[PDB]
Amino acid sequence: PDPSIDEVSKSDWDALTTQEQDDIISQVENLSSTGWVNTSRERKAEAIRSAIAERDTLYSGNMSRLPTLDGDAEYFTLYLSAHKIQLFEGGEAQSESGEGGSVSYSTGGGGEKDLQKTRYGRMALEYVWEDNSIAALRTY
Amino acid sequence: PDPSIDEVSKSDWDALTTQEQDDIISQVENLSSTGWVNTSRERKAEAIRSAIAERDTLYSGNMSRLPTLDGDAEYFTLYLSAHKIQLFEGGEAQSESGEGGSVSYSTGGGGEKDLQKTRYGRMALEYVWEDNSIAALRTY
Amino acid sequence: PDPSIDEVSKSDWDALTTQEQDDIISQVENLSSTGWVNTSRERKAEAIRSAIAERDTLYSGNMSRLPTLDGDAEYFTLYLSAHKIQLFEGGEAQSESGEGGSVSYSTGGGGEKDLQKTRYGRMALEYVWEDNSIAALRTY
Amino acid sequence: ATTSASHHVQAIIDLLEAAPDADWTPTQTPTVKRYWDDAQSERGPGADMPAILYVWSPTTSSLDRFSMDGDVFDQNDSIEVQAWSFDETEVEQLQGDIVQILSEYLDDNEVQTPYSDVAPTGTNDFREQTPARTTGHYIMSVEVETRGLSETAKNA
Amino acid sequence: ATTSASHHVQAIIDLLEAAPDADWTPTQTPTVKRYWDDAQSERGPGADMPAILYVWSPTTSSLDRFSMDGDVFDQNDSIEVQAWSFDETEVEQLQGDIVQILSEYLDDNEVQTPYSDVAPTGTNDFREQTPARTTGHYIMSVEVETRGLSETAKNA
Amino acid sequence: ATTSASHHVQAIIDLLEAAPDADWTPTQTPTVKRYWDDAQSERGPGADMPAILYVWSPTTSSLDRFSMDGDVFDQNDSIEVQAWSFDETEVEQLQGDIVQILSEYLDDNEVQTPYSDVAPTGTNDFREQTPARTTGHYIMSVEVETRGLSETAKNA
Amino acid sequence: ATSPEGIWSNSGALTFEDPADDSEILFAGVRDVTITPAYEHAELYTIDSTFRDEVKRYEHNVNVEITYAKFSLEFAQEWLGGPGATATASQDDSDPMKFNLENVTPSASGGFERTTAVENVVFPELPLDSATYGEYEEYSLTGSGRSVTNLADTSG
């Protein structure tokens, strides 16, 4: 996209053209083979706007004078977006069964924090020190 | 590929021809018997671009002057790509069933972390000290 | 084969004739009763090329001036290749069921780490001190 | 004769293998197999390979009495052919092809085959079973019956 | 004319897609899909989206001998169309609509479709299954059968 | 006249709701619901409340061809009505009421209903299921078929 | 010559006309239609040979059998009234009502369109009421036309 998802804050996202938003949405839709085609535009836009806001608030600033977001901020925001889109539908699929036949995914077995609950969450989690508390400070 | 996958960063990948990208994609498609043929080209391109960026951000630099990426950076980037593609398709298949019959793929529960959760992840994980903190440094 | 799998590195594999590669592929195909006949040549070639590169980078050199690859480098590279081929196909089946006829293959939990997760890996693992670190050095 | 086979499963394998490349709709002629030629985890083609047809006999062959003489049984045999591919279009084309191949020999008076009749009797779609996330195989099938007079050696 | 499709599932998708917006009872024209277009956790429409119809073939297509010439199978095909929506009345309207749409072509002598006959043969209500606490899809369906003369190439 | 409803489930709900208070045996007129109006853990009445009737279609409706014209389907529809109460006597009375209510309209010329025929075709007792130890609902039901000529788009 | 071909029954458009006008008489809802030109045959045999010496044809008529399920009040009043009149009661006169009949029917492939036309069909008896409990009424006509006026491909 022309503006990248890491180049925009919440107020910037609201200031984008519909085309620039749709380009970013189209990038997020690459992260699933299903593309989430049965969820409407407004909900994917809300998830992205939320991911932007949550990055800028919960995953910003320094920790032992390292950035708290160590990985690529583009892909972090995309994975955080995909995580939110997934949670706008349900959990991870543990099992899916059709008119006939079935598949099951071993998507469980992780911890209890939100990011631990889904595949996109578990990817995003690596970009941000795995939520580890490595901060340090001193008297001067 | 003429430019192999370790010769390029995110901004280089975006500057390659479609032919150079498609040959790298073709190499990644060797890592599964199913080739991920029913996932579109752009989704595989996104996963590769993401793996390139993630390597250069999360799996770069040194620990006690050892490189953080000990194994071949080619096969590491391919495995990291294949891991992401598999997550775009919803993760591992633990079991499958239908009029073709049924199969179960001996996963167990596995580990909690993303690279532990899929076979391509687990192959990539050996290249990077199994994500351990071997780093050591001194006053001088 | 005339050039043996232990005599060739990644660059050498790319320099071999198609027949020399095919002889080595034919040797690898001996390690399964099925021969993996429904997986294409390119995928078996990629698995072998990867196993060669992975041997040379992750399973090379020394610890305490013992070789880190203690066993026969021929059979190590073959078992490492067979491990890779099997992982290009979902891994080991714990069970296979068809037209009523059914079987289960006693794999069990099988640990968590890469080489533990399939039979060919479990064989290859004995060649490399079971991934143990007998490494030792001293001041002089 | 094109087959002269011992048993119905091999007979239909021989018929499908005997088909010219021009009579298949896709670019690549499919590979024909007994259902038990391949292990389950490896069943169906890989990417960059031709589609696979699996042949077997799913139900009991009947052996009806033909007459009081007992020279022959009126034998009725049953077969299923499953087409496996990753392309949902290819399995549909193969279902068409299998019908068009095995709709030759419909009233073969034991000229090409050891049978009076080889006939597709129905077809199945199983594409609804392939889960949409994963790049798993699509499956479709043809059901084939087969009939002839089978010698008893009662009267030597 | 309207379809000329290679298989019954595509043929009925084409018929439902060919329907004018004015012939659908709701404000928004439904989306028509193969059953296997969508993953299970995402099956059915999201809120504010138009309703979804899923088409597939649930049972074996019969091929019967038409005559002892062997030129033709009397082919009988089976389909189900499932309507998914959050609105209990919308699915009921869609069931009415699907029956109406597919009640054209009732004795189409291969003019519109590749068939002699496309007909709704039964309908199902599954609204009783939807749990009342949760927002969740109501489902109803039309069962459709489809009949025609299908060529064998026996006599070329 | 009395209903004019688009679907059989709402049609029979409209009939049961149209019954005068005098035509029910108990003191309180029952409440009529679709099976999916209520969640399971609170399905059936509370104490100090009127008995509840749940209506739904349990099985496939038939659409048979009426003639070569294709102008109409002979449509046969199926419904179940379940009566829920804590009084074993009240459910028995309600079963007798539902029967004698829905035995009006037995041969409408689409006069009251949109049907040729609405008929109770059988009745069920399930009182043996209610565990005697706990307070809990008794259930009984009426099975109702419904038949009429139904239009088509064929001739417009 | 035109290739012989299968015919889907429901494709046929049967109509009746008053031969005084060529005006249509309303008739509908056919289920069975048989039209059969016939002659009596006389065969010559003599002592000179055991084989047939000659065969000749006489007493031409066209047998018409119709089963139908929509009652036509016009058709019945025409049958009662006799040629060029309608009646609400039996008529005490010797002239039966003569109907011109035409049936137009496409081939299953559309390869030809037969028109069969029959002059002066008369029916010895007319069913008025044909009730069976729990069924729609069904009616059988047996009659005889004077000759076939037309049997041709109507296409183009």
Ligand SMILES: [Mg+2]
């Ligand atoms: Mg290791």
Ligand SMILES: [Mg+2]
């Ligand atoms: Mg990590």
